[PDB]
Amino acid sequence: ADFEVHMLNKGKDGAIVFEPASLKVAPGDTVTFIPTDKGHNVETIKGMIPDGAEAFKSKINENYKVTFTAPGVYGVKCTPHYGMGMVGVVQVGDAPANLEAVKGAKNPKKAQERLDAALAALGN
Ligand SMILES: [Cu+2]
C-alpha cells in the first residue's frame, strides 16, 4: 500500500510539520512525501534506522517515494527545518527492535518533543 506524508509549512500540529508525523506501515509499503508547501525535504536522521536499512535523503521540493522494508522505527527530518521541529517517525511492523537507539539520541528540543510525540502515538 502507498501512504502520502505531506510536507507542510503548518498543519494540525502547528508550524513546519510532516503530516502525519507518525505512521505505521508494513514491509513493502511505500510512503510518498509530497512537497505540498515549498522549501522542504525528507531525510533519515542518522542513527535512527533499523538494522540493515538504507538511509535516504530527498531533494528540496522533490515528490519522493520510499519503499520501507526492514522492520523497526525510522526517524525522519526535513533538513532545513530539523532543529525547529520538522521531524516524524515511520514504523515498519510491531515491537520495533531499534526503539531504544532512537529514543536515546539527542536532538534540539523542538525536534525531540515531536519525535517523542510520534513514538508515543505509535504505541511506544
Ligand atoms: Cu521543512
Side-chain angles (χ1 to χ4, degrees):
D2 178 77
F3 304 86
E4 289 183 337
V5 170
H6 285 252
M7 305 192 288
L8 297 174
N9 286 335
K10 76 289 190 186
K12 289 170 170 226
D13 193 43
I16 51 170
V17 293
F18 292 100
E19 189 166 289
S22 57
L23 183 67
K24 187 177 186 282
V25 308
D29 288 345
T30 56
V31 179
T32 301
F33 293 89
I34 305 299
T36 282
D37 297 332
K38 291 180 72 165
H40 306 291
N41 80 322
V42 65
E43 176 173 6
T44 49
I45 299 170
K46 296 184 193 311
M48 303 193 178
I49 65 187
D51 291 355
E54 294 182 20
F56 59 77
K57 182 179 189 182
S58 76
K59 307 306 214 141
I60 304 293
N61 298 335
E62 184 180 11
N63 178 310
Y64 193 73
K65 187 179 307 291
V66 176
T67 301
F68 285 87
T69 54
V73 281
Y74 295 71
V76 299
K77 60 180 177 169
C78 167
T79 301
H81 301 134
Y82 164 62
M84 296 299 292
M86 190 163 174
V87 298
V89 177
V90 177
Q91 183 171 313
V92 179
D94 289 344
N98 65 320
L99 181 63
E100 294 307 311
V102 169
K103 288 178 65 166
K106 182 173 165 193
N107 300 272
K109 184 183 161 203
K110 297 165 69 154
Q112 192 68 66
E113 293 179 338
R114 285 219 174 139
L115 288 165
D116 289 356
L119 289 167
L122 291 161
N124 304 295

